[PDB]
Design a protein around this ligand. Structure first.
Ligand SMILES: O=C(O)c1cc2cc(O)ccc2cc1O
Ligand SMILES: O=C(O)c1cc2cc(O)ccc2cc1O
Ligand SMILES: O=C(O)c1cc2cc(O)ccc2cc1O
Ligand SMILES: O=C(O)c1cc2cc(O)ccc2cc1O
Lengths: 306, 306, 306, 306
């Protein structure tokens, strides 16, 4: 049938929440693919039963065979080592292997890369998979901004979705948080600062907390995978349902912000044709300087990956 | 049971779409109240069957008795003559009658007034119902801005919800459209103008179309009730589910924009305590002048109503 | 884009609720087509604004041109005179005209016929449109059973969806209500009768009320269109999302119940390939006798239509 | 605010999926409580960010303090050792501790027990918490039947939700699968057997697979928590939204099936008053014999627990 087929290359914790959410949303049939024997079959089985509770009809199957990429409409890559620069060349080899299978089996698939550092790994996969530049993106800004939006919303006592914000350049510690592009119910945050509903010092603390959220969660003896999963699914859904949402993602830069031949975080429009638009924020020189540091770091790590 | 009870005072076209949507969203039990004998019972019956299709369990009942206001959590008033200044005193008498029944039967209800001109009728109902100022609002800005947001979104090829905009002061022809407070994916619209993705002249046409939308629909031999209904339900849902959405509604001004003792359109925060916050936009003198004209017109009509 | 295109041939009351629901559910782009000049454009405009409230991105456009059928994935026909056997030949001519346009413009569309008497009009459209037998159905059983299910659920104080029931043969006054195939939470209704939670006499009253529901609503000075609309959308959604729901619809019989070369109501499975399965209930002789009377009446009216 | 407060006593894998789903569904504020220091705070933080993606406004907080039970509307207990009869007295002590805190802090809460063996642990908690018999249930039948329903649905190529089935007596290996109470689109499964769409031998294999599903998943090197979580949330939602769904759960028997003073699995109706109805299936002597074996085993383990 013409249900979408969504292959999750990597069936760890992020993969398991993604599968759950796809069934909840009835977005398409799911393949949980992993190198680990049998585990993806077990998670798939568990997840499949939830069709009953969710009033859905999505197949959820496990896979240890790359050829199950055949016919994929969407491919979401979480596979890779996480236990530092030394992992860069190992994760490059994984992107290479996956890219070759995408090129062979599903060259028209829309690809979302999650493996860190994402702004590096997405470009490596782009290059090895051969897909068009509008058909591959990395998870970054939707996740990082979810934190900033959420934290401001709790301070202001408003619905989380009503705070909008932009974090660009790269995922990770060089992420560029743009104070000037925060709004609350579409109103500039500065009005709420002028009114003393939130202070500059509070926002600085919230910015630091945002940058350091993954660390804060790890130091609490948990690990971040629920928000990453939800962010990816928001992206995947925008593509699949042709919503044309403006979502901040890692995408190929072709001159925006003065940068070419590299991937970086920026608002894009995701619909049925993939990345339909790349939006270039009209950054000032001070914001562009931080954007430049983010790109420099992506480049440093990209060189080590080879 | 502690399901919310939602009484629709007026069971015309807007009332019928509201009932449908409440069932679709499983928001609470519905009473379709009207002065017209038997018709609300028929619409209620029709609507009740949709619980099966929607997987919901909301009672939908008709009523020709004001005492069915008893126990209402939410009251939505669409009743009133629509077939001009001459209707003002007639509609005042209807607000008076309804207000007396609210005071008697459901003084703790959250009230949404729709009857036009809304910025007048809401204050009349406020005064006769005796409810607190945080417990009554009028439909205006959510509906007017839905048009502006939608039209920009189609020009820019982005998800409609990703355009945010502010229209304040009053509903109707003196509505104040604030170009400066339009954003796209949280980005100032001016960036899209600077980039030539949309022109100033296009936006002027879209503003005119926005102001004149109800007229445009009437002149096409239809009448606006689906968007009005959806806008009201977004408001009602924010209250019922304590979402704390920032939504532009007609609310009592107590000094904001230099105005007191009158209702006017402005962003508010709607949650479990009703109007939790009134947000005052930091308008410039030119925007404040148009806000003043809107209020003057509400006042002119309020005087004729008595 | 590969969003589904859904053309509503007829933009009256049922058409307007269908458009609303499609946007609410983000099911696809909508064309409101009608013979009446300009009205469908006005309803379409009104409906389009609700994308903002619903977080959807469905185009809603009006049409007075049959060639807008081009590219339709789903076509829903409500057009036809309702103001009796004399209307039969007039409505035949309308089905003929529509069928010719479907054959020309969208021969691979999935078709849902609503125009009454539906078990006649669906076969007339089938014959003139040339579509495959698995690609056209009529609204009947989902709507009639929604009433029976709802009324039992209110008596038993259970969730409406948890009552399941079968009404077969035809829509309208010869509909066959099958007491033996009613369940509550998957349990035979007879257990609830044995327990005295519901009596045989109560059920007889509920059966009569079911058969006479459209009349009951009309006699209350309303008209049935909200439940019809929701029922159609449940059918359309099952097709579009490949849900494979078991839904009772008017479909071509090829020997089931002893009948061929005629359409009649029976459970079918609706998924991406249209009618994937026709389910033949193992009726006893007394139930088959009533099924036969329903078919006889469809045949009597089909003869008058030509 | 009058948002529901839902405390998850136990923040392991099932707890983490439950929190995710509550946010997705905007069902209420969540407390992830656990004995383990800091981990629930980390999962809570991760989960909280998803409010942005989900358009929700649910607080998600961690807790290592039992007094955070105060004001709970719903309490879901997953805490307990899983690494056999020897764990019975340890898990009894945990139920005792939790029960004392419920009695003190939230005696009007609706309680769902998950800890295994559930039909034992639920009664232990009932006894120590002091709550009314209509306010505490155990997870069993919704989960076990999700498997049976799902597996039949895939064989028959129908929507999973359209298969309904009953598994009673107890959760675990003595669960009673009732072939006679399986339906497909409300039609007796026997009709599909008579038609050769599914064989008796196939169903026997599906029954075995159902009983052994948790084992099958564990033997695939995964563990069951996604379906358990979804099943619990379906139950919790029915209560919170007063849906009055018929759901098979472990509940106090007071003579049904010849059993008193023990908990066992049976269809109940869950709404705003908790267990509003206990439905007693009219089992035959052969089915009652298996129901008796299930109860005997619950009793054997209950004796060892003390
Ligand atoms: O959640 C995040 O934002 C995050 C970010 C990063 C960044 C990075 O460079 C490595 C690993 C992670 C892991 C994560 O969970
Ligand atoms: O849809 C609208 O915006 C609208 C606005 C107004 C304003 C007014 O003053 C009278 C009537 C209507 C009716 C309407 O449908
Ligand atoms: O709602 C119905 O069931 C219904 C049924 C029928 C049957 C019929 O033969 C003509 C018209 C209608 C109109 C309706 O609204
Ligand atoms: O998933 C199940 O059905 C299940 C059932 C049982 C039964 C039991 O007695 C112990 C543990 C489990 C764990 C589980 O995951």
């Amino acid at each position: 049938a013409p249900k979408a087929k969504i292959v999750l290359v990597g069936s760890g914790m992020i993969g398991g929440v993604m599968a759950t959410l796809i069934v909840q949303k009835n977005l398409g049939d799911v393949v949980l693919f992993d190198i680990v024997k049998n585990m993806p079959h077990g998670k798939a089985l568990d997840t499949s039963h939830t069709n009953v509770m969710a009033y859905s009809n999505c197949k959820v199957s496990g896979s240890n065979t790359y050829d199950d990429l055949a016919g994929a409409d969407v491919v979401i890559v979480t596979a890779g080592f996480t236990k530092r620069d030394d992992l860069l060349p190992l994760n490059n080899k994984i992107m290479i292997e996956i890219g070759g299978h995408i090129k062979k089996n599903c060259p028209n698939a829309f690809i979302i890369v999650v493996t860190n550092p994402v702004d590096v790994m997405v470009q490596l996969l782009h290059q090895h998979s051969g897909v068009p530049k509008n058909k591959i993106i990395g998870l970054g800004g939707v996740l990082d901004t979810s934190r900033l939006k959420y934290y401001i919303s709790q301070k202001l006592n408003v619905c989380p979705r009503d705070v909008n914000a932009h974090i660009v350049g790269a995922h990770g510690n060089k992420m560029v948080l743009l104070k000037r592009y925060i709004t609350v119910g579409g109103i500039p945050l500065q009005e709420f600062i002028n009114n003393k509903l939130i202070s500059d010092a509070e926002l600085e603390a919230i910015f630091d907390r945002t940058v350091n959220t993954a660390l804060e969660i790890v130091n609490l003896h948990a690990s971040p995978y629920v928000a990453p999963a939800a962010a990816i699914i928001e992206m995947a859904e925008s593509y699949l349902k042709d919503l044309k949402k403006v979502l901040i993602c890692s995408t190929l830069l072709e001159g925006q912000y003065g940068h070419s031949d590299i991937f970086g975080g920026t608002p894009v429009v995701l619909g049925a044709n993939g990345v339909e638009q790349v939006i270039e924020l009209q950054l000032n020189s001070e914001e562009k300087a931080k954007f430049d540091e983010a790109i420099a770091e992506t480049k440093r790590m990209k060189a080590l990956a080879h």
